[PDB]
Design a protein around this ligand. Structure first.
Ligand SMILES: CCCCCCCCCCCCCCC(O)O[C@H](COC(O)CCCCC)COP(=O)(O)OC[C@H](O)COP(=O)(O)OC[C@@H](COC(O)CCCCCCCCCCCC)O[C@H](O)CCCCCCCCCCCCCC
Ligand SMILES: *Cc1cc2c(cc1C)nc1c(=O)[nH]c(=O)nc-1n2C[C@H](O)[C@H](O)[C@H](O)COP(=O)(O)OP(=O)(O)OC[C@H]1O[C@@H](n2cnc3c(N)ncnc32)[C@H](O)[C@@H]1O
Ligand SMILES: C/C=C/CC/C=C/CC/C=C/CCCCCCC(=O)OC[C@H](COP(=O)(O)OCCN)OC(=O)CCCCCCC/C=C/C/C=C/CCC
Ligand code: HEM
Ligand SMILES: COC1=C(OC)C(=O)C(C/C=C(\C)CCC=C(C)C)=C(C)C1=O
Ligand SMILES: O=C([O-])CC(=O)C(=O)O
Ligand code: SF4
Ligand code: F3S
Ligand code: FES
Ligand SMILES: [Ca+2]
Ligand SMILES: [Ca+2]
Lengths: 238, 588, 129, 113
């Protein structure tokens, strides 16, 4: 059938303020396609339209967009889930983050918070293994749901706490990654890591709103991860 | 002099698996280095890798690197260098455990339904190996490996230039590579990155087909830059089509499936892979298993449906648990794209474009080579290549499953560990006149002034289509002939192609266009090569020449560029090593 | 644009443009319920003040409570207060472990909460009367 | 350690909010239980309820827990919406005074009965 789209547009050198532009992409009513597919087509009709994309299979994190009020990956959001007769398909950039052009936002502040929490293994080196480190399946199991983050920022983008404190409150993705190392048998700086998150903003700005769980493409649960970090803190500072 | 400059003792163009492993190593050596990327490093095609890393660790069972050599040499068809493969397989373990010490989320061993063993990296059974030597971390080993490595460049504070587009290399009056030019996608400014060493790691470019497992980013920018600069490409017709791509989707599904015990069946309920490779079964090599299913489609005996002529990849029989603990990433791509839960029904798989074994010829240290007037190997001053963009001559004519990743790390690190030494050797390299620099800006200026030209979408589409038909799994002289001409038609066409967006703030089009040229030079080289070779080896299958030419075609076809001037084709080879090795019969 | 330096990038922050889960509504109301209550104590203290000062005082308070407009306000306070306690407890329960941190488990918690709130609100209204 | 925040650090604020929340919940039930067992409230019954050492001590324990609790809470809210420093400090000041007065007035009312 036909498809009426509503897309966010903005170009620093032409526009001086954002606008929503109308689009119609008459597609074959044969099968369902992802929203990226639409966009690609539309881009053929209109070149100026820019946005990010790559793996195309929901594994790179490039196409994070807010579709009809909800954040997701354009590469795996079926047009079925977004089509309602008479109404337009509103596609906008991720909330909160600055807009570089069209649907492309500056992810700067996002990666920053990621770095603050030290996204890498810390092993004092005391007790070197012969070959690889000792990691029993039961210990390695603890990392599930914590190492699959693809840094799409759908979660953080959906968190009001993160809107008010982009640079003070770490945010969903970063705490999920902090936890990945906090419970990693191979990491030896856990207590040191916990002292670095005891301030008032780093973690405690989380009010358990659960919008982050709501939107995760990978089905990850930052709220639950943040709940365990809070516990660790209580054990170490009380 | 109006163009900005950024001096580094090195420039690593590409943030893939290999590009970061090198940028890391080069930095450990106290060498100033800039790392560039078209996308944020974690989005490179490597994140998509599944299967795992095949390396002889001996966890799953006792093993030696030599068995890794035999499994791999016969895997390439004695078209892959013994010297290089040796080095890789041998240096394999140490290099991988290194990654675990960096915190890589490997799967672990101990208790399972009917299995049991210590904390080693879990090694899964894979195609081309007598037993299980594939270290895997769930279905997402690439994602684990790519993220770890990024986390590492975070710790070691590597200078990263995210979302910068490298255009063309910049040559020295003496014909040396001295850095390159690149575009800041964000602002749109252009800059010349001058360096005493310019490392290319721009991945493959399977985008020159209509159905590939690769991403929209794999456009062979690397290949394009090499040719437009003067550098050849080895075995640029050797393309491995993955056996289990997804019918109608082109999205990949791990060979690990067969590894964990997956069936590759036909509608008549027989396991045709058992009949084709009577004793090796589904473990059969890459090149071989592809033609098996693809054939069943030629005879009108291939399964069909909404998705299209496919082959059933039965896995349901395995426990839903095992599938969720070992292949979580698979169980979703199938439902998401194939609308079929593998826990209960097989998967509509088909051989689709995958790894590109061809690419810039290099020594083990990663240096780029070109031929001499006589036809002798001559290193290229200031240029190195690692990853898929490089044909170090390791996979030869058939890349063994899980060896690419092992390639990335080993040779990515190899280039790093040797960089200072190589520079010493080439010596000092002289500056570049604005003329040299200006030259590289040509491709850009062209596109930016030409606006009434032709629409690149068609050119792009055509290009992929032709390659798809005339250079598929099976091909023949007459075919290449037509395509090879069609291409010239299109390559001229592409010269008047236009650029609609002339903006600065993130111009996706301008970027995509620039990538088109690379698609063009890439596909071209692929053809002139494909046609040339007179034998049916590894991924190369000609109905006209069904047997491999041991005497004539046991060599590396060297595509001879001259930039945009007229082309040529030559040869190369490598039988000597340490433990020794003879060609033979290839029965999988 | 500071002085002699331009262009500040826009941001997508139109709330009517964003779709919020019921869990997101639950917690922002808990926040709004707290500020209402913060002010509420002052009003109750005032009343408590009058109420005990002396008989004539108790009378004057008994009559102010008489106004139905005041009855309506005394009603919003108790409702806001009740809401805040219920969601607050839902909150403390997830923190410790008497409630799943899963999304579904969260939406169900939020719903049961509003339900108990409305009921208490009703009780509150019977009392005000 | 943020000067406006009561807590020396985050974990502190977490606890103090939870601890006061529990105490205040008991107190509310206590006061609610009383009203739902009164029907027609007589000046004799009202003053009788407060002239009780127990009701006096609980009522002042709640007021004190409100100070600590609303302090931290109002502080969190302000940290999110009032970004201009000068303005926010004025508010925190108005709020902490108001809270302190609530407790002092509490004392006055209580010993006066
Ligand atoms: C588990 C979680 C716990 C929940 C926590 C949430 C708490 C908030 C929710 C509030 C719920 C209230 C529920 C009340 C209730 O249940 O009402 C009951 C109704 O029950 C039914 O309908 C039966 C149905 C059964 C179905 C199964 C009893 O109601 P009655 O029948 O007595 O009706 C009044 C009557 O008409 C006869 O009425 P009257 O003529 O006697 O009225 C007289 C009127 C005027 O008297 C005065 O002038 C004195 C006023 C004194 C005010 C004192 C305020 C104290 C402030 C202390 C602050 C300390 C910091 O009286 C008023 O109408 C009385 C108003 C009472 C307001 C009470 C609120 C107390 C809040 C205390 C805690 C504050 C905390 C601040 C932080
Ligand atoms: C597609 C694919 C491949 C794959 C796999 C699954 C899929 C779906 N599973 C594998 C497996 O289990 N085992 C294995 O050994 N290999 C597997 N592969 C293949 C493998 O992914 C690739 O060989 C490997 O990823 C290649 O890595 P490399 O680092 O060489 O390349 P890349 O990851 O594609 O990244 C290239 C980088 O270069 C940047 N780039 C490219 N062009 C430019 C320009 N012009 N300017 C600046 N940067 C450029 C990219 O942005 C990227 O970072
Ligand atoms: C006066 C009447 C108001 C009572 C409403 C009680 C809530 C009922 C409920 O569960 O709604 C769920 C719905 C979501 O359903 P859904 O999530 O779309 O589907 C779930 C179906 N259970 O929730 C809403 O539509 C918003 C409910 C907000 C209630 C606020 C409490 C305030 C009390 C003031 C008095
Ligand atoms: C004295 C009456 C009360 C007042 C004035 C009050 C006020 C506040 C304020 C202003 C906040 C912070 C707003 C926010 O950041 O969401 C808050 C949070 C909270 N309150 Fe209360 N409160 C009161 C009673 C209670 C009671 C009786 C409980 C126990 C059920 C409670 C439990 C909580 C909890 C758990 C939070 C945390 C919310 C978060 O961190 O987002 N409160 N309160
Ligand atoms: C838990 O969810 C939420 C918040 O809390 C952290 C918010 O802050 C906001 C934003 C609120 C604004 C701009 C108005 C605030 C108003 C008052 C009366 C306090 C929203 C949408 C929200 O969903
Ligand atoms: O490329 C390979 O090594 C094979 C692979 O990833 C897979 O089968 O999933
Ligand atoms: S946790 Fe989920 S939503 Fe959040 S950044 Fe990672 S993949 Fe994206
Ligand atoms: S939405 Fe934000 S407030 Fe916590 S529960 Fe998720 S990180
Ligand atoms: S393009 Fe990578 S997840 Fe959508
Ligand atoms: Ca630890
Ligand atoms: Ca290669």
């Amino acid at each position: 059938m036909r498809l009426e789209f509503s897309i966010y547009r903005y170009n620093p050198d032409v526009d001086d303020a954002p606008r929503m532009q109308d689009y119609t992409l008459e597609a074959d009513e044969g099968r369902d396609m992802m929203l990226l597919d639409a966009l690609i087509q539309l881009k053929e009709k209109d070149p100026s339209l820019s946005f990010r994309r790559s793996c195309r299979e929901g594994v790179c994190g490039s196409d994070g967009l807010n579709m009809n009020g909800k954040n997701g990956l354009a590469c795996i959001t079926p047009i079925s889930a977004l089509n309602q007769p008479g109404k337009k398909i509103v596609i906008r950039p991720l909330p909160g983050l600055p807009v570089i052009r069209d649907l492309v936002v500056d992810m700067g502040q996002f990666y920053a918070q990621y770095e603050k929490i030290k996204p890498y293994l810390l092993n004092n080196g005391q007790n070197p293994p012969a070959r690889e480190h000792l990691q029993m399946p039961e210990q390695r199991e603890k990392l599930d749901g914590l190492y699959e983050c693809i840094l799409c920022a759908c979660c953080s983008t959906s968190c009001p706490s993160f809107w008010w404190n982009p640079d003070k409150f770490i945010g969903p993705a970063g705490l999920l990654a902090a936890y990945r190392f906090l419970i990693d048998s191979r990491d030896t700086e856990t207590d040191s890591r916990l002292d670095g998150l005891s301030d008032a903003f780093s973690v405690f700005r989380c009010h358990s709103i659960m919008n982050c769980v709501s939107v995760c493409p990978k089905g990850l649960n930052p709220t639950r991860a943040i709940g365990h970090i809070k516990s660790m803190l209580l054990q170490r500072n009380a | 002099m109006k163009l900005p400059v950024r001096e580094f003792d090195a420039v690593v163009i590409g943030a893939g698996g290999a590009g970061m492993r090198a940028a890391l190593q080069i930095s450990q050596s106290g060498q100033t280095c800039a790392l560039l990327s078209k996308v944020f490093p974690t989005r490179s095609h490597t994140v998509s890798a599944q299967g795992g890393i095949t390396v002889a660790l001996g966890n799953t069972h006792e093993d030696n690197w030599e068995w890794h050599m035999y499994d791999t040499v016969k895997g390439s068809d004695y078209i892959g260098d013994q010297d290089a493969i040796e080095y890789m397989c041998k240096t394999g373990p140490e290099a991988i455990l290194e990654l675990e010490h960096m915190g890589l989320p490997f799967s672990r061993l101990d208790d399972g339904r009917i299995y049991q063993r210590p904390f080693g990296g879990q090694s899964k059974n894979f195609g081309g190996e007598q037993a299980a030597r594939t270290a895997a971390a769930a279905d997402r080993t690439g994602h684990a490996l790519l993220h770890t490595l990024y986390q590492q460049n975070l710790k070691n504070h590597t200078t990263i230039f995210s979302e910068w587009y490298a255009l063309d290399l910049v040559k020295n009056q003496d014909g040396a590579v001295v850095g390159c030019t690149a575009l800041c996608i964000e602002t749109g400014e252009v800059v010349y990155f001058k360096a005493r060493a310019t490392v290319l790691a721009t991945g493959g470019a399977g985008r020159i087909y209509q159905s590939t497992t690769n991403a929209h980013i794999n456009t062979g920018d690397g290949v394009g830059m090499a040719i437009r600069a003067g550098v050849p490409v080895q075995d640029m017709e050797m393309w491995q089509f993955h056996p289990t791509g997804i019918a109608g989707a082109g999205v990949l599904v791990t060979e690990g499936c067969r590894g964990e015990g997956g069936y590759l069946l036909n509608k008549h309920g027989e396991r045709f892979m058992e009949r084709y490779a009577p004793n090796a079964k589904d473990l059969a090599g890459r090149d071989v298993v592809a033609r098996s299913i693809m054939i069943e489609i030629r005879e009108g005996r291939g399964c069909d449906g909404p998705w299209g002529p496919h082959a059933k990849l039965k896995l349901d029989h395995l426990g839903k648990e095992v599938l969720e603990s070992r292949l979580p990433g698979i169980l979703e791509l199938s439902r998401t794209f194939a609308h079929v839960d593998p826990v209960k029904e097989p998967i509509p798989v088909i051989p689709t474009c995958h790894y590109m074994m061809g690419g810039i010829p290099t020594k083990v240290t990663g240096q780029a080579l070109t031929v001499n007037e006589k036809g002798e190997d001559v290193v290229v001053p200031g240029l190195f290549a690692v990853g898929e963009i490089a044909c170090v001559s390791v996979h030869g004519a058939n890349r063994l499953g899980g060896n690419s990743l092992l390639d990335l790390v080993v040779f990515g690190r190899a280039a790093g560990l040797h960089l200072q030494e190589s520079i010493a050797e080439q010596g000092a390299l002289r500056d570049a006149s604005e003329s040299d620099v200006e030259a590289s800006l040509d491709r850009l200026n062209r596109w930016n002034n030409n606006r009434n030209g032709e629409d690149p979408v068609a050119i792009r589409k055509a290009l992929q289509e032709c390659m798809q038909h005339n250079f598929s799994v099976f091909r023949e002289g007459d075919a290449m002939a037509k395509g090879l001409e069609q291409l010239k038609v299109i390559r001229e066409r592409l010269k008047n192609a236009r650029l609609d967006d002339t903006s600065s703030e993130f111009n996706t089009q301008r970027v995509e266009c620039l990538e088109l040229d690379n698609l063009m030079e890439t596909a071209y080289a692929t053809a002139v090569s494909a046609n040339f070779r007179t034998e049916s080896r590894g991924a190369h299958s000609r109905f006209d020449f069904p047997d491999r030419d041991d005497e004539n075609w046991l060599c590396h076809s060297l595509y001879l560029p001259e930039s945009e001037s007229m082309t040529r084709r030559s040869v190369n080879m490598e039988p000597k090593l340490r433990p020794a090795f003879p060609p033979k019969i290839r029965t999988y | 644009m500071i002085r002699n330096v331009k262009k500040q990038r826009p941001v997508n922050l139109d709330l009517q443009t964003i779709r919020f889960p019921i869990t997101a509504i639950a917690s922002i109301l808990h926040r709004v319920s707290g500020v209402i209550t913060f002010v509420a104590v002052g009003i109750l203290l005032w009343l408590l003040g009058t109420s005990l000062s002396s008989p004539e005082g108790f009378e004057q308070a008994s009559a102010i409570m008489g106004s139905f407009f005041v009855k309506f306000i005394m009603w919003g306070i108790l409702t806001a207060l009740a809401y805040h306690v219920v969601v607050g407890i839902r909150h403390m329960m997830m923190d410790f472990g008497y409630l799943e941190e899963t999304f579904e488990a969260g939406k169900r918690s939020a719903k049961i909460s509003f339900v108990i709130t409305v009921v208490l609100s009703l009780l509150a209204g019977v009392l005000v009367w | 350690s943020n000067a406006s925040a009561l807590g020396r650090n985050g974990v502190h604020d977490f606890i103090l909010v939870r601890a006061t929340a529990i105490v205040l919940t008991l107190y509310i039930i206590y006061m609610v239980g009383f009203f739902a067992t009164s029907g027609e409230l007589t000046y004799e019954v009202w003053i009788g309820f407060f002239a009780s050492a127990f009701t006096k001590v609980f009522t002042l324990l709640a007021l004190f827990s409100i100070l600590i609790h609303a302090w931290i809470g109002m502080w969190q809210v302000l940290t999110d919406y009032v970004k201009p420093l000068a303005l926010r400090l004025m508010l925190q000041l108005v709020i902490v005074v108001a809270l302190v007065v609530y407790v002092i007035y509490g004392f006055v009312v209580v010993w006066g009965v």
